[PDB]
Design a protein around this nucleic acid. Structure first.
Length: 513
RNA sequence: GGAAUUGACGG
């Protein structure tokens, strides 16, 4: 593009840099500048420098000009959207329209803008769907059509999304494994959540199976693509949004009898987590348990802890196999009867235990970060009722004081202790653990996660231990007040009241039985 | 997310 044009858009940018221009003037200048793009929208939106100015113009103009720009650039909009600079010009146009959604008077004008864009996309969509830049434009455009519940454009969402899915089954087979087309479909799927009528139209298109039934050869192909990084991400979202009838058919024809081999794949195991999390009924819980529970030790040992966390969670939600689940986990981590007192530390440091040299002497991992998914599993465990988790409660409450304080100071382990304080273990078991934290509520309050742990302990205590925690928080009132959660904790526990009028503080705390 | 799975994305 010529210097007259570059200088012009540079000069407009400098005029906005120098914030000597009000808001009503800004939007008129933005509008007047957009006109200077008529007939060279592709050239200007894709220039590595001027594109940034054009963004500023689009996010600052008035609706009637924004729509003029969209209307005039529509025949070149896919080319803009697939350009590494134009794609942000295209998204700036969409973000701009999005700012008028909550204005009810703009509907028909926006809708026409969206229509001109969707028509040129739907006429030739596959390259844009697989393009790294164009896929972002599509993902944003899909969200814009869905909008918010006040103003949305449902017919546009459907019109657009149908264009994207109306290719050959062989084309669709390669949409499934392309990262960027996969991301596009993932967005569309979530936007159609709870739209059972439309979900039942599109999921079979994406899976290439044309009641809803998967044929035996289609299942094989689906199954065989499951280890792919892009398809696996797509099927995760399919399982999240799939209506019941469709979930059941995918459970039986695709996943039944391949659960364990899928669970050990570095990509597919996440499909399996999604499948577990969205199981529907008793029979399904059974089938999953038979194929997977005998292999719990495999799953933790091969770095696939999330499968076990999912089995634990759906066990609660379906109220099935709770005891079998808990017991299966102990046996996986503690083989000899003697070592079942170590269930807690071995899960707190899941990766350090399964990876140490000599397992029969591993006790702890001093000063190390505790294991995120291990601790998530324990949080899971402590939502079961006390009937099912007696080894877990005994193990936690039997840890020596310095291990328990290490756990509370760990921002994953503290969530374990808190899940335990919220469980239905006996108050005396809870009290025994809290007492071993004595002498450390001071340092614990000072960190941000620990501040939560101090209050949740306090809430579970008798007066004797409320008064002890309170005196500990008092020795550190200065440092604690100068932290982020500190002032809340000092106020929520009424620490100033405790130092000034100890008798009155005690009497107001005891009045909470 | 107060820690946030073991496998993806931009001038």
């Amino acid at each position: 593009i010529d210097p007259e044009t570059s200088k012009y858009f540079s000069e407009i940018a400098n005029l906005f840099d120098s914030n000597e221009v009000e808001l009503e003037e800004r939007s008129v200048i933005c509008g007047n500048a957009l006109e200077e793009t008529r007939g060279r929208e592709y050239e200007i939106a894709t220039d590595y420098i001027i594109s940034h100015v054009l963004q500023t113009l689009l996010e600052g103009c008035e609706l009637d000009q924004l729509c003029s720009f969209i209307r005039n650039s529509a025949s070149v909009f896919p080319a803009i959207a697939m350009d590494r600079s134009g794609s942000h010009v295209a998204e700036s146009a969409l973000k701009s329209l999005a700012t008028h959604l909550e204005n009810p008077d703009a509907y028909s004008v926006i809708e026409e803008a969206l229509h001109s864009i969707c028509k040129v996309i739907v006429d030739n969509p596959l390259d844009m769907m697989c393009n790294c830049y164009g896929s972002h434009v599509l993902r944003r455009l899909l969200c814009l059509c869905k909008g918010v519940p006040h103003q949305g454009f449902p017919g546009m969402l459907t019109y657009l999304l149908s264009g994207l899915l109306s290719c050959s089954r062989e084309d669709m087979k390669y949409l499934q494994v392309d990262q960027y087309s996969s991301l596009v479909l993932q967005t569309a799927l979530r936007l159609m959540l709870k739209q059972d009528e439309q979900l039942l139209e599109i999921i079979p298109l994406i899976l290439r199976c044309n009641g809803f039934h998967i044929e035996t050869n289609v299942a094989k192909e689906i199954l065989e693509s499951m280890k792919d990084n892009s398809f696996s991400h797509l099927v995760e979202v399919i399982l999240e949004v799939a209506p019941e009838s469709l979930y059941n058919e995918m459970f039986n024809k695709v996943f039944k009898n391949s659960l364990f081999e899928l669970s050990v794949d570095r990509c597919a195991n996440f499909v399996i987590q999604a499948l577990i999390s969205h199981a529907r009924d008793q029979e399904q819980m059974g089938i999953m348990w038979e194929e997977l529970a005998p292999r719990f030790k495999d799953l933790l040992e091969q770095g696939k802890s999330g499968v076990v966390a999912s089995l634990i969670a759906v066990s609660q939600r379906l109220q099935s196999h709770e005891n079998k689940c808990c017991e299966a986990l102990v046996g996986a981590v503690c083989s000899t009867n003697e070592s079942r007192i170590s269930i807690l530390p071995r899960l707190l440091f899941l990766d350090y235990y399964f990876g140490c040299r000599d397992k029969s002497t591993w006790e702890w991992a001093p000063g190390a970060k505790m294991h995120v998914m291990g601790c998530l599993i324990l949080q899971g465990i402590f939502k079961f009722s006390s009937d099912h988790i007696q080894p877990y409660i005994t193990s936690l409450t039997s840890m020596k004081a310095e291990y328990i304080t290490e756990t509370a100071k760990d921002s994953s382990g503290a969530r374990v202790i808190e899940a335990f304080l919220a469980s239905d273990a006996a108050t005396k078991q809870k009290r025994r653990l809290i007492i071993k934290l004595r002498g450390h509520f001071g340092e614990l309050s000072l960190h941000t996660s620990g501040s939560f742990t101090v209050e949740k302990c306090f809430d579970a205590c008798n007066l004797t231990l409320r008064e002890a925690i309170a005196s500990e928080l008092l020795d550190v009132k200065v440092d604690l007040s100068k932290t982020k959660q500190g002032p809340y904790l000092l106020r929520k526990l009424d620490i100033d009241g405790y130092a000034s009028r100890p008798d009155q503080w005690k009497s107001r705390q005891e009045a909470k039985q």
